[PDB]
Design an enzyme around this catalytic site. Structure first.
Site, short mmCIF file in Angstrom:
data_model
loop_
_atom_site.label_atom_id
_atom_site.label_comp_id
_atom_site.label_asym_id
_atom_site.label_seq_id
_atom_site.Cartn_x
_atom_site.Cartn_y
_atom_site.Cartn_z
N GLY A 220 0.69 -1.21 0.00
CA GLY A 220 -0.05 -0.02 0.02
C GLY A 220 0.99 0.94 0.14
O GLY A 220 1.90 1.15 0.55
N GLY B 162 0.65 5.76 -0.20
CA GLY B 162 -0.17 6.95 -0.34
C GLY B 162 0.73 8.31 0.40
O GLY B 162 1.81 8.03 0.43
N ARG B 163 -0.03 9.32 0.35
CA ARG B 163 0.80 10.44 0.81
C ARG B 163 1.24 10.30 2.34
O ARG B 163 1.97 10.93 2.63
CB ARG B 163 -0.20 11.72 0.85
CG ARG B 163 -0.72 12.23 -0.64
CD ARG B 163 -1.66 11.45 -1.34
NE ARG B 163 -2.86 11.19 -0.36
CZ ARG B 163 -3.35 10.06 -0.41
NH1 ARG B 163 -3.43 9.29 -1.39
NH2 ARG B 163 -4.07 9.78 0.51
N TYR B 164 0.74 9.37 2.99
CA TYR B 164 0.98 9.05 4.21
C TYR B 164 2.50 8.34 4.34
O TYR B 164 3.01 8.34 5.37
CB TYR B 164 -0.10 8.37 5.01
CG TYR B 164 -0.05 6.85 4.12
CD1 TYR B 164 0.86 5.86 4.77
CD2 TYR B 164 -1.09 6.63 3.23
CE1 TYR B 164 0.67 4.52 3.98
CE2 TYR B 164 -1.11 5.15 2.62
CZ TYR B 164 -0.40 4.40 3.05
OH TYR B 164 -0.41 3.14 2.47
N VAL C 202 3.01 1.21 3.27
CA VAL C 202 2.88 -0.31 3.94
C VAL C 202 3.46 -1.37 3.33
O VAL C 202 3.25 -1.69 2.02
CB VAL C 202 1.43 -0.36 4.39
CG1 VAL C 202 1.37 -1.49 5.30
CG2 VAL C 202 0.62 0.94 4.80
N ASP D 77 -10.78 9.32 10.93
CA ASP D 77 -10.56 9.06 9.39
C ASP D 77 -10.97 7.78 9.41
O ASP D 77 -10.22 6.87 8.51
CB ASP D 77 -8.88 9.14 9.35
CG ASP D 77 -8.62 9.33 7.68
OD1 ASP D 77 -9.63 9.69 7.16
OD2 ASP D 77 -7.51 8.98 7.26
C1 LIG Z 1 -3.84 -6.41 -1.94
O1 LIG Z 1 -2.86 -5.95 -1.27
C2 LIG Z 1 -2.56 -5.78 0.03
C3 LIG Z 1 -2.46 -7.39 0.72
C4 LIG Z 1 -2.40 -7.49 2.26
C5 LIG Z 1 -2.49 -6.22 3.04
N1 LIG Z 1 -2.31 -6.30 4.47
C6 LIG Z 1 -2.48 -5.23 5.57
N2 LIG Z 1 -1.96 -6.13 6.90
C7 LIG Z 1 -1.91 -5.01 7.92
C8 LIG Z 1 -2.05 -3.60 7.88
C9 LIG Z 1 -2.29 -3.42 6.52
C10 LIG Z 1 -2.91 -1.84 6.40
C11 LIG Z 1 -3.46 -1.32 5.49
N3 LIG Z 1 -3.69 0.03 5.52
N4 LIG Z 1 -2.96 0.44 6.77
C12 LIG Z 1 -2.58 -0.68 7.51
C13 LIG Z 1 -1.43 -0.47 8.45
C14 LIG Z 1 -0.45 -1.14 8.85
C15 LIG Z 1 0.45 -0.69 9.95
C16 LIG Z 1 0.09 0.02 10.99
N5 LIG Z 1 -1.19 1.02 10.61
C17 LIG Z 1 -1.89 0.57 9.32
N6 LIG Z 1 -2.65 -4.03 5.47
C18 LIG Z 1 -2.58 -5.01 2.39
C19 LIG Z 1 -2.64 -4.88 1.11
#
Ligand SMILES: COc1ccc(Nc2nccc(-c3c[nH]nc3-c3cccnc3)n2)cc1
Length: 294
Positions: free
Chosen positions: A13, A15-17, A20, A132
């Site tokens: 993931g 973004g502007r933040y 991930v 948010d």
């Molecule tokens: C399709 O591709 C993908 C497949 C799996 C995942 N799995 C996942 N597992 C844990 C957290 C996040 C996450 C999404 N937004 N923010 C956070 C986050 C993380 C840490 C702290 N604070 C927010 N995403 C994401 C995309």
């Protein structure tokens, strides 16, 4: 430090933040959120919330560590949490349809995470508003429940002191999900309940997003984000103001929902999240109670 023990594997993931990453720690997947230099105050706030409040809950993203590290000979702020391979609710709703059990389980788990955040507990946590909430900030767990993520804008309140703690973060909420009083800028920022009702508005929009993907009479709506039909991608502040405040528009309830008992219940819930007047909206606990009954 946990950051130096992690192997970054792939970016999941961005973004502007910041970013991930799926990382490997102790031979398990972890999520590594690497903040951009423009969003250091969100890293600080999330680290503050997780370290000073007992936040462990089945429907709140689980915190592992918060670290400062060096990458490319410069400082990175990392926040490490549990990883959820099923991804965000936003991505998940596009890859599958839901039945009644799976739809209710998702929205009830979100209501439980939110109510837990909103409620002050003694003997123990302060009351917390998120600010948010959106389907991209909600993750899907392998058991079909969800957990709420991203506390970088959270606001806290405690009764013993009657102290409101709004933090020090110039970041504002995602414009697509902003409540009318945010967009017309009349929200009373000195009052904690103002922020709980901003969350309730957004939760209404999430409820709508999920409900569209529940099958009834064999049909389903395509995934769409709230207000998809009337604002472009990355809508401006004035775009949302015109639609939400000036024209008083709300997401459309499909006709087919009223032929189904569950979706008719859900449709009444989301409508009571959407009063222009924040005092009129339901509370997280009332939503949780109703959802547990359906
Ligand atoms: C399709 O591709 C993908 C497949 C799996 C995942 N799995 C996942 N597992 C844990 C957290 C996040 C996450 C999404 N937004 N923010 C956070 C986050 C993380 C840490 C702290 N604070 C927010 N995403 C994401 C995309």
């Amino acid at each position: 430090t946990v950051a130096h023990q992690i192997t970054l594997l792939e970016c999941v993931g961005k973004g502007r933040y910041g970013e991930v990453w799926r990382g490997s720690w102790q031979g398990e997947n972890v999520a590594v959120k690497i903040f951009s230099s423009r969003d250091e105050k969100s890293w600080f706030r999330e680290t503050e919330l997780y370290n000073t409040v007992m936040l462990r809950h089945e429907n709140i993203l689980g915190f592992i560590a918060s670290d400062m590290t060096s990458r490319h000979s410069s400082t990175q702020l990392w926040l490490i949490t549990h990883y959820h391979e099923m991804g965000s609710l936003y991505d998940y709703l596009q890859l599958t349809t839901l039945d009644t059990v799976s739809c209710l389980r998702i929205v009830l788990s979100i209501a439980s995470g939110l109510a837990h955040l909103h409620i002050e507990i003694f003997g123990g946590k302060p009351a917390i508003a998120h600010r948010d909430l959106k389907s991209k900030n909600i993750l899907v767990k392998k058991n079909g429940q969800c957990c709420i993520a991203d506390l970088g804008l959270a606001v806290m309140h405690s009764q013993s002191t009657n102290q409101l703690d709004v933090g020090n973060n110039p970041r504002v909420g995602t414009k697509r999900y902003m409540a009318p009083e945010v967009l017309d800028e009349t929200i009373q920022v000195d009052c904690f309940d103002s922020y709980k009702r901003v969350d309730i508005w957004a939760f209404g929009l999430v409820l709508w997003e999920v409900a569209r993907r529940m099958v009834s009479n064999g049909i389903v709506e395509d995934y769409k984000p709230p207000f998809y039909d009337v604002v472009p991608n990355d809508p401006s502040f004035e775009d949302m103001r015109k639609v939400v405040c000036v024209d008083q528009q709300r997401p459309n309830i499909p006709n087919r929902w009223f032929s189904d008992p569950t979706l008719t219940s859900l449709a009444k819930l989301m409508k009571e999240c959407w009063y222009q007047n924040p005092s009129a909206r339901l509370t997280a606990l009332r939503i949780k109670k109703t959802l547990t009954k359906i």
